[PDB]
Design a protein that fits this description.
The chain is an all-beta fold and about 30 residues long. Helices cover about 0% and strands about 30% of the residues. A hairpin with a 2-residue loop joins strand 1 and strand 2. One of its GO terms (biological process) is killing of cells of another organism.
Amino acid sequence: XGXXXXGGXXXXXGXXXXXXXXXXXGXXX
């Protein structure tokens, strides 16, 4: 949950992303 996106998105919620960053259900932090 350190954020990220690289133009993908992000911002709390349930995580998401991948990029570029993100995380949640898949880690990231």
